[PDB]
C-alpha cells in the first residue's frame, strides 16, 4: 500500500548528490549475509553503509565483509561480553577524520549501539537505540538513554552539522505506524518514547529528513514483525530515520525507504546529500 | 664517539622531503611516556610514528595518545593474551588506504609484532622481530620467522614500493655493533640471523637506507644495554632500520639515528622521503 517515490538525486538548487548513505537493521549480520544482503548493498552502492543488530563480535566478522568494493574503511562495535545481541557497524568509502564509539557515558556504552564518524563537512552517527522491552520493562532506562543521547548529540551538532541515522526504536507520530491505537502502550509508541523523539528534534535541533520531504505521506514504514506476515499486509512501523541538522536541509536531495529489499524484518533506508 | 650528520631534507634531484617517518623501540609505552617520550615526538613532528615494545594492551592505551597533534590515525597490535610483552603501534597524520596486522601466518601472528599500512605510493611495515633469546633458545624459531617474514614482504613489494621499519633484532655486519667478536654467539649477531638479514635485502629486494647513505661509517648504533651504562661508552648495536625498495632510492633524502633522544634503551631513527 506504499510505493516509495523515485530517487531525487539533486538538491533544491540543482546540485547533484555527492553522498549516498544507507542504513539498515540487518537482524543478524550472518543471517542477513546469507539472505544476499551484501548483494543488495552492492547494487545500491552507497558511499557509507551503517548497520544495526549485527549480533556479531568485532573479531568474528564474516570474510564476505573484506570483499566490499568501495566500502573498505570499516568500524564495528558490539557488546564487550556476550554475543548475539545488539552491535553496530559503519563502512565507508572514504576514511573519516575520526571515529568514536558510544555516547561518552559508561552505563550507556556497554551494548555496542553507537558509532561516530566525523568527515570534512559533517559528523555521522549511527545508533541502535535500546528498545523499551516487553511489558515496557526497560522503559525507565530508555528514558534515561534518551536524555543522555540528546545531550551528546547536542554537543556534536554545536561544532559540526550532524547526520544521525539508524534504528531509533520509536514511531514518532500516528502516521509513522499502521496501528497507533493498539500500540500506545507497547515499546516503540509510548507517549514517553514519542516525547523523547520530539525533544531530540527540537533540542539539538534536527529535522526528520523523510517527514520533511513527505509530511503528509502515510503507510511509509521500515519494520514489520515477521509474524502473521505483517510485511505483506504492510502492518509496519517507521523506526529507522535520517535526522539532519537544519543547516543541512539545503543539501538534502532525498530520503528513501527501500520497502522492497529483503533480508531482515527492517528494510534499508537511503539518504542523498549534495555536499 | 658518534655524531649523526645534519638532516639532508632534499632528494638527490633537489625534491624537498614530503614524508618523515620516525621509528622507536620504546621499551614500554607507559614507561617511555613517563620519560617524556611524547615530548620528543612532538618536537620531531613526524608524519608517521611507529613504535615497538609497547607492552600495552589495545584497550589500555594511555590517554596521552589521544592528544597527539597530527598523528590522529592510530593502529595498535599486542599479544592477544598476557600483556607487558611485545606490542607495536603505528600512528599516522594521514589515513592509510588500508591497515593489516601480522604476516599472514597464524603461528607468527600471535605476539603483536607487525602492522602494515598502505598509502598512495608505498606500503609501510613496522616490525618487532622475535629475538633469538638467552642461550639462543629461540634461534630455531627466529630462523623460521625470518623466512616467513621474507616471503610476506616479497609479496607486498611485488605490488607497491615497500618501506620496512622497526627493531629487526640483528646487527647486519661487524660495523653494526661495537663488539662483534664477543657477540658472534649471542642473540642479534649469530651467523644465522646475519644471513637471514642478507637474504631479506637480496630477495625482496630491499636497501638498508642508513648504510646505503653512510656505507663506511662506524659506531652508529640504536640500542645500548642499560647495564654498565653502555650508552655513555657507546657500546651499542644497530638493531633498528629503514629498509626501502630499490625503486624508492631516488626518493631517499636521509636516514637518521637520533643518538641523543632518551626514554628507552633504543634511540629513535628517522627517515625522510621525497614522494
Ligand atoms: Mg531483531
Ligand atoms: Mg626491552
Curated annotation (Swiss-Prot), chains A, B:
Changing residue 253 to A: Does not abolish the redox activity. Changing residue 22 to S: Does not abolish NO-induced nitrosylation. Enhances NO-induced nuclear export. Changing residue 56 to A: Does not abolish the redox activity. Its EC number is 3.1.11.2, 3.1.21.-. The modification Phosphothreonine is found at residue 190. GO terms for biological process: base-excision repair; base-excision repair, gap-filling; cell redox homeostasis; DNA catabolic process; DNA recombination; DNA repair; positive regulation of gene expression via chromosomal CpG island demethylation; positive regulation of transcription by RNA polymerase II. Keywords: Acetylation, Activator, Cleavage on pair of basic residues, Cytoplasm, Disulfide bond, DNA damage, DNA recombination, DNA repair, DNA-binding, Endonuclease, Endoplasmic reticulum, Exonuclease, Hydrolase, Magnesium, Metal-binding, Mitochondrion, Nuclease, Nucleus, Phosphoprotein, Repressor, RNA-binding, S-nitrosylation, Transcription, Transcription regulation, Ubl conjugation. Changing residue 256 to A: Reduces the interaction with TOMM20. Abolishes localization in the mitochondria. Monomer. Homodimer; disulfide-linked. Component of the SET complex, composed of at least APEX1, SET, ANP32A, HMGB2, NME1 and TREX1. Associates with the dimer XRCC5/XRCC6 in a DNA-dependent manner. Interacts with SIRT1; the interaction is increased in the context of genotoxic stress. Interacts with HDAC1, HDAC2 and HDAC3; the interactions are not dependent on the APEX1 acetylation status. Interacts with XRCC1; the interaction is induced by SIRT1 and increased with the APEX1 acetylated form. This is DNA repair nuclease/redox regulator APEX1. It comes from Homo sapiens. The gene is APEX1.
